[PDB]
Amino acid sequence: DRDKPAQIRFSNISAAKAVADAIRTSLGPKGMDKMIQDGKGDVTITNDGATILKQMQVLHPAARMLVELSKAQDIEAGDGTTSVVIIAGSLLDSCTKLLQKGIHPTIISESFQKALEKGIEILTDMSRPVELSDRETLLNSATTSLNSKVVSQYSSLLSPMSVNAVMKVIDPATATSVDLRDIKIVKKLGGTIDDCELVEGLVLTQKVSNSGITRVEKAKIGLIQFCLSAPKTDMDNQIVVSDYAQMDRVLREERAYILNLVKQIKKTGCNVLLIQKSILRDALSDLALHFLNKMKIMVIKDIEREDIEFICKTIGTKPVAHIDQFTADMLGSAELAEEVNLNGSGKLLKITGCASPGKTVTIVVRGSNKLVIEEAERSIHDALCVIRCLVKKRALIAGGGAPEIELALRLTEYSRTLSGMESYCVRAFADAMEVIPSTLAENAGLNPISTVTELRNRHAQGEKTAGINVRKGGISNILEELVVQPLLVSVSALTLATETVRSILKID
Amino acid sequence: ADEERAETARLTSFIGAIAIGDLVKSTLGPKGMDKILLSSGRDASLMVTNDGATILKNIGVDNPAAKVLVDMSRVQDDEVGDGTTSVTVLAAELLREAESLIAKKIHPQTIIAGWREATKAAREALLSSAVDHGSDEVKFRQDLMNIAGTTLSSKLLTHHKDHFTKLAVEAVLRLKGSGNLEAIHIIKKLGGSLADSYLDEGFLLDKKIGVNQPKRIENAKILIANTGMDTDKIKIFGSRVRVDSTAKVAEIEHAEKEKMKEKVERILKHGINCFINRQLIYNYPEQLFGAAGVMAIEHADFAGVERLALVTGGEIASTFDHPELVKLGSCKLIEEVMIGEDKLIHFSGVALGEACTIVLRGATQQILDEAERSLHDALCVLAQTVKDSRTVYGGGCSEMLMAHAVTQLANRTPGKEAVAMESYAKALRMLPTIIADNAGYDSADLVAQLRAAHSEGNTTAGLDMREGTIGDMAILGITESFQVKRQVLLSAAEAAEVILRVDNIIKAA
Amino acid sequence: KSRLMGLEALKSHIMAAKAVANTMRTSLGPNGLDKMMVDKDGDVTVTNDGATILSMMDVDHQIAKLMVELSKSQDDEIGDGTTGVVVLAGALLEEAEQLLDRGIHPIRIADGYEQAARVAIEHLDKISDSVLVDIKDTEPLIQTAKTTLGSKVVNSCHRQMAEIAVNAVLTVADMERRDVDFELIKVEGKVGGRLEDTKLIKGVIVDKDFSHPQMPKKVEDAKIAILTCPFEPPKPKTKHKLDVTSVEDYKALQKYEKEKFEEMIQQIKETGANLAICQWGFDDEANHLLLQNNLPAVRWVGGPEIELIAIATGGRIVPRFSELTAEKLGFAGLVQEISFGTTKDKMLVIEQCKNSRAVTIFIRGGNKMIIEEAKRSLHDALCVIRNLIRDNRVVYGGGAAEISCALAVSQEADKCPTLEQYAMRAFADALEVIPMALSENSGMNPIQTMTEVRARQVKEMNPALGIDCLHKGTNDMKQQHVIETLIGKKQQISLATQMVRMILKIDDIRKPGESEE
Amino acid sequence: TDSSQGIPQLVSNISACQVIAEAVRTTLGPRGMDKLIVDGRGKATISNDGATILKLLDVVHPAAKTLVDIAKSQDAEVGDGTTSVTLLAAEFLKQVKPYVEEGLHPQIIIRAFRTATQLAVNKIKEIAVTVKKADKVEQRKLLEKCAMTALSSKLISQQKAFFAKMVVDAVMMLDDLLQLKMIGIKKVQGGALEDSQLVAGVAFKKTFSYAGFEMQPKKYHNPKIALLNVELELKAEKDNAEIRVHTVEDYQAIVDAEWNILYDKLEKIHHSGAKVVLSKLPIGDVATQYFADRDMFCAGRVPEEDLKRTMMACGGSIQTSVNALSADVLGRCQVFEETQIGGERYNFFTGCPKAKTCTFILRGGAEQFMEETERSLHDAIMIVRRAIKNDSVVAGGGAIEMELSKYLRDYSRTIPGKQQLLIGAYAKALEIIPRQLCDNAGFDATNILNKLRARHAQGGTWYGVDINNEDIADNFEAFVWEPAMVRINALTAASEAACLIVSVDETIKNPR
């Protein structure tokens, strides 16, 4: 009666293992990037699993679970992206066998879920603390962890920007988690990687003010979440259509309101008005908006509400959907609010400094073109994430799956001492580890088998007298050229996988 | 039309019920393992649940017998407050049990009549399996805690349950007059973690009128009210408003103000320190209430309005049929308080101490709404466990008790009944199998052990499904409130028979 | 064009009465496994007296097409044995074809079956007694009114429902000079109460109409004043309003309401009761101002609802505000507002002692289906007492009357002989079916059970005993207190051989290729 | 153009003729195979006559389709002889068709056809026994002894004598046609067989219980009868009709206007002459309150026959005007009585100014009892009312059928060659008629008929199978009877469509 679930579980774990296997080639920088013609019949070229797994995906629920599991490592660490995909089927290689071997699905789950903690705990033994208080060290280590990886390009410049933006919003010496919540990443078309820089107040969409002063200092930050307009028929001017005097007189209706509705805007008063996009509005009366800025309130219109949401928190400008909601509290207090059309091309209102909770940072990402902007972002996103991970994880760990080649030995060793039905599992649990760096030893090219086998003894010796060194792609100290990562991406990939593998065992 | 006659309809009575059993039994207990929920209307969209009620919907039920049990599930789920996935496979077991036997030519008449008193035969044993726990209050504390984590366990909260296992019993701990879903005020509000879930001792308005009305009023005389301060409800003072002219907008504006000012002054004639309006409160009155030093809460939550009235001991305005005649709530403090991230107007000093406002703190609402939902489920048991403070040894232990009881009663009764009654007594012993099979442990071992245990009459020793061994039922927590089983033992021991009565099934579709 | 000849037809003919009567044979007695009905939309409901399930069945076959008609008058006058005749009409055909399987005319044996009925009838006429009386009959009816509601809705029924069921009948059953028909008695289902709770009413009971409880919610007298016209200014159950041009016209407007009330009241006051049944509804505002005035009305009354209280009272509905008399008003020995349950508004209880053309027994209920299941059960038993109170005639059987008439009619075929020697033998063989074929559905063995009351026929005839249809330890018709109206079984004797003859009647099977619609 | 020639058509012509004959075959006997023939129209056909069924289907062959018409005609002639002509020409085409292969179709076919039936119709007409008044009976017992003959099939009791006497008089009272249509028995649930009424007027089965219906006269010595083809129902002016309502005064006015258009239409027909109002269409409870307040009897959804049946006997014309002031479309009786008979509220029109309906009212308060009774009472009319038509009554049950085929065989010698055979074919065709009953009476054709042909080689007078007596005997003495007319009629329609299609191997058509 529980046959079909096993069959389903087979069908699950099969298509589970399946989609996770294809990346095990593209796993790593030496992992080979696939130009993929899609349902669109058009090429798509990527290396990391997540993008690959999303950009062409059909629907298998376990596969759908893994693209999340993929996304998980992303949304979790922003880091170690390709890794979590590889461990799942590796674990399932143990699981499916153990399931074939007959180990009850609930067992293998709590087997590997218990065995999880033992792995990352020996990882905490493997873990090497670096200073989360020292910006330099973070500037030194994270970039080196980024230099364990591909991009130093703008990073080695933008890690001075990344580590700082983080350091600036870093309160603790621990530097804690620090999601990018207080780091506002905005671009600017013109400018440079050098004109990319951190700014201490929230840069606002363009500056949209018609008669609104180009700069107002000490800015009450108004927010308009309500329409500027008198009722519509065929325009902001409400038009009943027969003869043109009615639509001329209903103006007296329409005109006075959009004036007074504005007069009401300046009653409480605002130095800046946050106004989201007019399609994030039903519509915004220019008639008002004219006389609005003609009462001299500097404004930004056309801004994302999520900007506003970012702005409602980070500078604490409380959401204003209404004129009762016009209040010095819901009207945010900016130290300085200006616009800079310059230092590169494009126009943006610069809030520079403000009344802000949780520090705040905006980085305005510039460059000779959008791409120079784009990779700069891709230069920080890693730095942005690897720091916030490395600070999220007090210590650091060398990369290349060598800690797993260590740990696969470590747990299998104790998995003996563990004994229990799960000894067979917890060994096979750890045994799942070394396949991943093996695949890299295959992905960089090497014997994935010969080497990682020997590394388990290398990692039985100094635990690193050798590791998997990506540029060498072979038996090497990964501390001689640092191949190094925050503890999380290790933990992250692990803690995700088992859970994702866990419920599937418990899934019928 | 299309008549499904006995055998086919019985196999059809089987197809859903038996196969519906497959999942809900696979999810039975915490080590009960989940079924993927495939949403065939919404994408393939996948959901993973330990609960059968959620299963009963996503993929709909054609099978009438299974369609029947969806009621029974929900019935038992809602009424018992627990036993959702349980009572269902319980109907699957006996129908499965009756399969070969009615396929052995045995009449359901023979069958039903056999399981009838067999169902009752478990009762006296169940009524004997009734173990009074909670008779003492320290018992009742641990007694609630016994079943506190019990209900939420198979209701698919595996994380913050412990935090609620402590919370839910406290609100239930104070009641003691009766299990109370009204005096107890249920609030779940975002902010804080789900282990930050809070208990306001008193009434709570998750409303906040802010400083628009006075925020802090001590020894506040409450007006619990439906009384409209804009809409201006009945006992209306004036002519029926009318517009005969272009400029007529003025008088209707001025006419309502009096009508508003009346109910202001009239409720200012309560002397109430805080005005709680189940409707809104307009600008003219609220600026009058605010100038009256009175907190005017507008559009306050309907049951809470009564809960306020209840727990603060006050009365509700009765749709302003009582102009001054509505009695007044008095709580020693009315304070808008920040619990979690949000300001809520908290009423402490309310006339009911048994009353507790549990304020559930969402890290997100999707767990938070699931939190109280499943959290409210233990309350049913707990409320009825307030009323009957009693226990039954869980983990299939009372099963094995009622098993032997009917298993001997099979040999004690015997006949066309023991034809059925043995099949019955097997489904009794089939429950310990599932959780152990869910736990992936040897049932025939743990059953026949627990059989030998209840053949030695040990119901204080049972299958302990945490580690999934046979072990004590000392009320380790593995023991259940007597309410659940007698409830759960019922409907499927009924419906399965009830399903055996329908034989000719005419489906006109 | 197709023509399916004779046996071909007969084959087709038999394809139903085999299974579709077996649907009853599976359902014979309470121990007969009951019939679930799933609808055209997939709506599951349990059924018996399968003329229900046969109407709920959709007929692909002329016998199925016919049987509902054949089953109707049984479920009409008798109300029970709807399962029996269908079996019995479905059974003897199976013996009848077997005789044409023996190569016998359907012609011959049907004739010999027709009078086999007759000879069973008199033999049936012997069973029990053909007279029961008011104090006597009640308890066996109270048994039947139980065991109908005790088998078919509750397990014990209720001595509320049993007695209140026989009394609803016994009410008009005495009015009709020891007869009754249903319309005279009407079970009014409304749920929210309990199945147990049944208000026996001599007339209409419906929810009263008020506005404010602070203003009087009251019935006046025991008399109703029935009005098509206003007791409160008539609003043709559609949009109608009041409006004013000034604050003072507002003041002028409300005295209109109160005076029209008084105007209407004063008319409806002086002409008897005060109490309105007013077809049309009025504004919920001046409705309390009519309460405030006095003497409440009932507004928004159904178009037929005023007529229901009209003639059943013995009066009429007042057709016009100017045309007014107590005759055009109501005649009621009781009218009073009474709360239905604790769950909703007062039903206005009109218990009409000034006349009843319908004595309407109200029934509360826990659930629709089960208050239906009661009402389901009721009208079945309502008609058996209806047989009794008309001519008080009972028969011990269903375990007996068959094997009783099964004995002698087959015995008669010995003295019959030729074409009727097989008929009245094989006729009574269909009688042999039901009590046996009842025990079929039971855990007891039908063949075994038959042999017993068979041996009983050697012992005892037309017996007060029989099989247990209640699946008891005792096998009786008396310690069972099972019975029907000697009408019913005889009425049930009528139908079975009636379709047997009916599939014979013409020689014409010729169809377009359509013998089914 | 479509067409046909050759014997493969001619035989095909015969076959369908043989098919349709087997439908009606024994049907007029109460026993047989009854299958409801229910069509895509939804119409169950239990029809005794195949004519109705012949109305329902069609034959690709005009051949079979033709004889249908004349057989339907023969049915539509007397109301009888449905199966008669149906079998004969078919039996003919059954008889010869092997000879057709030998060849007959050369017009020596028809030359035998018309002859031997002309031999018969005289050989018939001489054996025709003329009886009406004081020939045997009172003139009344004729119908009885013909009705007691018909009622003899239905078992029951001396109710047959209770019936026969009553089924006689209306046939004599109303006497116009052979039609029992206006005479038609109206089945009444309630009452015993021992009371079954014969209404020389028109007495309505069911009028409804209305508001004040018991409170309006159910009794007249003068029903002034509004035969309304339109309804007076309360919705002729709707109770949802609206009005301007400012105060609660206007409320009073609208429902009053809702009421009057009803009262208007109905009082105008009331005010005419009419104390009886018959709407073949419904009546409203307020409309009947008007009727109750009118003190002039009314009815609604009245049977249109009973409306027409009144139009016959009561002199009133069915009234197209629901507002009518006309008293000529009104009608009278010298009694309107309403006795609730059993449970039905049952009107009497009687003392009608005309006998244009004398209708029998049958009781026994059942279905088995009553429907069998009235079944024979149709031929306790159709025979007896025809026993009036042709006073020469030839015995039923095959009395002539065999005694003719006797002489027909006796003549079949000297007639030469082909028609030699065709006479015996023609002769044998008469022998299906008694064997209709042999199945129904449960007997062999041959022996039982050879008995008869022995008796018709011997006594030869009325000997024939008597079905419900399950025997053979002289039928005219046995009361088994039919007036000699339809026989020759059938005999004329027998050899005719026979000698027609036997000349058809050729049938022609167009698709276009």
XYZ file of C-alpha atoms in Angstrom, chain B residues 168-465:
298
model
C -2.004 27.790 25.091
C -2.223 25.953 28.405
C -1.737 29.164 30.414
C -4.807 30.787 28.864
C -6.624 27.492 29.442
C -5.017 27.110 32.878
C -6.784 30.182 34.268
C -10.258 29.402 32.927
C -11.397 26.639 35.300
C -14.976 27.853 35.120
C -15.227 26.147 31.762
C -13.026 25.832 28.724
C -13.599 29.257 27.257
C -13.143 30.383 23.654
C -14.697 33.798 24.401
C -13.218 35.042 27.678
C -9.949 33.840 26.153
C -9.264 36.408 23.452
C -7.476 35.223 20.326
C -5.159 37.711 18.614
C -2.421 36.992 16.091
C -0.387 39.986 14.959
C 2.690 40.363 12.779
C 6.033 41.409 14.235
C 8.311 39.475 16.524
C 9.086 35.847 15.883
C 6.603 32.992 16.133
C 8.356 32.038 19.374
C 7.776 35.671 20.365
C 4.039 34.897 20.384
C 2.563 36.871 23.237
C -0.130 36.517 25.881
C -1.895 39.720 26.889
C -3.484 39.121 30.274
C -6.673 41.095 29.898
C -8.641 42.173 26.870
C -6.747 43.434 23.839
C -7.794 45.711 21.042
C -5.420 45.065 18.190
C -7.090 48.304 17.148
C -5.170 51.475 17.826
C -6.941 54.822 17.829
C -3.568 56.366 18.592
C -3.459 59.789 20.221
C -6.422 60.866 18.096
C -8.224 59.668 21.223
C -6.539 59.458 24.647
C -4.065 56.580 24.557
C -3.665 55.980 28.324
C -6.738 55.883 30.559
C -6.468 54.193 33.958
C -9.473 52.692 35.757
C -11.125 53.356 32.429
C -14.895 53.155 32.314
C -15.539 51.429 29.003
C -18.452 51.936 26.713
C -18.745 48.764 24.679
C -20.800 50.044 21.785
C -22.142 49.447 18.309
C -23.090 53.099 18.239
C -22.403 54.789 14.921
C -20.819 58.202 15.231
C -20.953 58.841 11.466
C -23.516 56.368 10.143
C -25.666 57.324 13.155
C -27.634 54.123 13.872
C -31.207 53.766 15.141
C -32.986 55.696 17.860
C -32.265 58.376 15.262
C -33.028 62.016 16.123
C -34.292 63.997 13.168
C -36.327 63.920 9.991
C -35.383 61.451 7.290
C -32.681 63.318 5.369
C -33.559 64.564 1.884
C -32.052 66.571 -0.966
C -34.515 68.878 -2.690
C -32.022 71.433 -4.046
C -28.495 72.131 -5.272
C -27.363 73.750 -1.997
C -29.147 71.226 0.254
C -25.749 69.692 1.148
C -25.548 72.037 4.141
C -28.542 70.993 6.249
C -27.890 67.246 6.009
C -24.349 68.005 7.155
C -25.706 70.050 10.066
C -28.536 67.617 10.830
C -26.174 64.667 11.304
C -23.900 66.720 13.587
C -26.643 66.990 16.210
C -27.444 63.319 15.623
C -23.720 62.742 16.108
C -23.499 65.218 19.003
C -26.448 63.507 20.692
C -24.780 60.089 20.781
C -21.560 61.824 21.804
C -23.228 63.586 24.735
C -25.507 60.593 25.354
C -22.415 58.399 25.592
C -20.692 61.267 27.357
C -23.618 60.708 29.736
C -22.176 57.268 30.468
C -19.203 59.075 31.945
C -17.199 56.343 30.221
C -13.456 56.936 30.197
C -13.031 54.942 26.965
C -15.580 54.652 24.155
C -15.348 51.428 22.167
C -17.401 51.587 18.973
C -17.990 48.480 16.897
C -18.708 51.010 14.136
C -16.556 53.950 13.088
C -16.401 57.383 14.725
C -16.620 60.492 12.544
C -14.496 63.640 12.739
C -17.047 65.776 14.598
C -17.739 63.106 17.282
C -14.138 61.886 17.588
C -12.968 65.461 18.097
C -15.748 65.609 20.689
C -14.702 62.295 22.248
C -11.094 63.481 22.160
C -12.130 66.768 23.755
C -14.101 64.734 26.300
C -10.921 62.987 27.445
C -12.567 59.785 26.246
C -10.802 57.208 24.120
C -13.094 56.479 21.184
C -12.161 53.243 19.395
C -13.876 53.007 16.022
C -14.906 49.850 14.152
C -13.616 47.640 16.965
C -13.603 43.912 16.262
C -17.025 42.354 16.666
C -16.347 39.366 18.935
C -13.667 41.369 20.725
C -16.273 44.071 21.323
C -18.216 41.364 23.162
C -15.020 39.844 24.568
C -14.183 43.317 25.856
C -17.730 43.567 27.218
C -17.402 40.036 28.615
C -13.884 40.036 30.015
C -14.074 43.617 31.293
C -17.515 42.814 32.694
C -19.195 45.606 30.752
C -22.175 45.750 28.422
C -22.581 46.583 24.720
C -24.665 49.574 23.581
C -27.288 47.235 22.022
C -27.414 49.245 18.775
C -28.128 52.406 20.815
C -31.437 50.973 21.935
C -29.851 51.750 25.291
C -28.939 55.454 25.117
C -27.636 55.476 28.691
C -28.905 51.996 29.588
C -25.851 49.964 28.492
C -23.669 48.930 31.430
C -20.049 49.991 31.413
C -16.795 48.052 31.339
C -14.144 49.012 33.847
C -10.530 47.934 33.492
C -7.814 49.375 35.701
C -5.726 50.288 32.649
C -6.318 51.101 29.003
C -2.905 51.361 27.374
C -1.838 51.271 23.754
C 1.217 49.018 23.971
C 3.872 47.928 21.520
C 4.145 44.152 21.632
C 6.305 42.914 18.814
C 6.481 45.710 16.238
C 2.936 47.064 16.511
C 0.950 49.313 18.835
C -2.191 47.657 20.165
C -4.563 49.029 22.797
C -4.216 46.586 25.694
C -6.890 46.285 28.358
C -5.696 44.940 31.697
C -7.746 45.059 34.846
C -10.619 43.500 32.918
C -13.215 41.820 35.122
C -12.269 38.314 33.901
C -8.958 36.863 35.063
C -9.635 33.477 33.491
C -9.853 35.548 30.305
C -6.546 35.733 28.469
C -5.677 37.510 25.259
C -3.117 35.416 23.425
C -1.382 37.735 20.968
C 0.341 35.528 18.426
C 3.432 37.197 16.993
C 3.969 36.457 13.320
C 7.382 36.341 11.844
C 5.150 35.908 8.810
C 1.382 35.565 8.609
C 1.454 32.339 6.585
C 2.781 30.473 9.612
C 0.957 32.794 12.013
C -2.481 32.071 10.555
C -1.555 28.385 10.507
C -0.259 28.809 14.065
C -3.510 29.887 15.734
C -5.555 27.646 13.430
C -3.775 24.519 14.658
C -3.281 26.215 18.035
C -7.040 26.676 18.370
C -7.370 22.924 17.859
C -5.813 21.910 21.179
C -8.067 24.497 22.840
C -11.128 22.449 21.847
C -9.597 19.416 23.557
C -8.209 21.623 26.334
C -11.556 23.384 26.791
C -13.231 19.975 26.917
C -10.278 18.735 28.965
C -11.089 21.562 31.360
C -14.589 20.094 31.503
C -13.416 16.472 31.565
C -9.924 16.357 33.045
C -9.174 12.823 31.939
C -6.666 10.864 29.883
C -6.265 7.811 27.673
C -2.946 6.133 26.984
C -1.983 7.005 23.424
C 0.509 5.557 20.983
C -1.917 2.745 20.201
C -1.896 1.690 23.862
C -5.600 2.228 24.546
C -6.054 0.527 21.189
C -4.322 -2.585 22.483
C -6.405 -2.304 25.634
C -9.625 -2.011 23.651
C -8.180 -4.618 21.297
C -7.956 -7.399 23.884
C -11.223 -6.165 25.386
C -12.983 -6.685 22.093
C -10.490 -9.410 21.119
C -11.645 -11.412 24.104
C -15.150 -10.046 23.577
C -14.840 -11.596 20.143
C -14.241 -14.891 21.942
C -16.599 -13.758 24.721
C -19.528 -12.744 22.437
C -18.812 -14.961 19.676
C -20.930 -15.367 16.574
C -21.800 -13.393 13.456
C -20.674 -10.558 15.704
C -17.255 -12.110 16.437
C -17.102 -12.655 12.706
C -16.956 -8.872 12.541
C -15.632 -8.209 16.050
C -12.289 -9.880 15.352
C -11.949 -7.804 12.184
C -12.878 -4.894 14.449
C -10.299 -5.858 17.085
C -7.699 -5.944 14.309
C -8.292 -2.327 13.307
C -7.804 -1.666 17.011
C -4.408 -3.314 16.648
C -3.959 -1.714 13.221
C -3.630 1.730 14.768
C -0.420 0.847 16.667
C 0.915 -0.523 13.382
C 0.544 2.723 11.432
C 2.430 5.053 13.773
C 5.089 2.361 14.162
C 5.088 1.842 10.407
C 5.160 5.625 10.144
C 8.013 5.423 12.636
C 9.324 2.553 10.527
C 9.490 0.049 13.368
C 8.247 -3.497 13.620
C 4.547 -3.379 14.354
C 3.917 -7.100 14.853
C 6.752 -6.807 17.320
C 5.554 -3.595 18.977
C 1.926 -4.693 18.603
C 2.220 -8.283 19.828
C 4.573 -6.934 22.489
C 1.955 -4.355 23.365
C -0.511 -7.191 22.910
C 1.481 -9.223 25.437
C 1.638 -5.967 27.395
C -2.147 -5.636 27.311
C -2.395 -9.407 27.507
C -0.669 -8.706 30.793
C -3.095 -5.802 30.939
C -0.413 -3.119 30.846
C -1.962 0.062 29.506
C 0.564 2.078 31.502
C 3.055 0.544 29.086
C 2.537 1.204 25.404
C 4.143 1.965 22.061
C 6.138 5.147 22.635
C 6.473 6.479 19.122
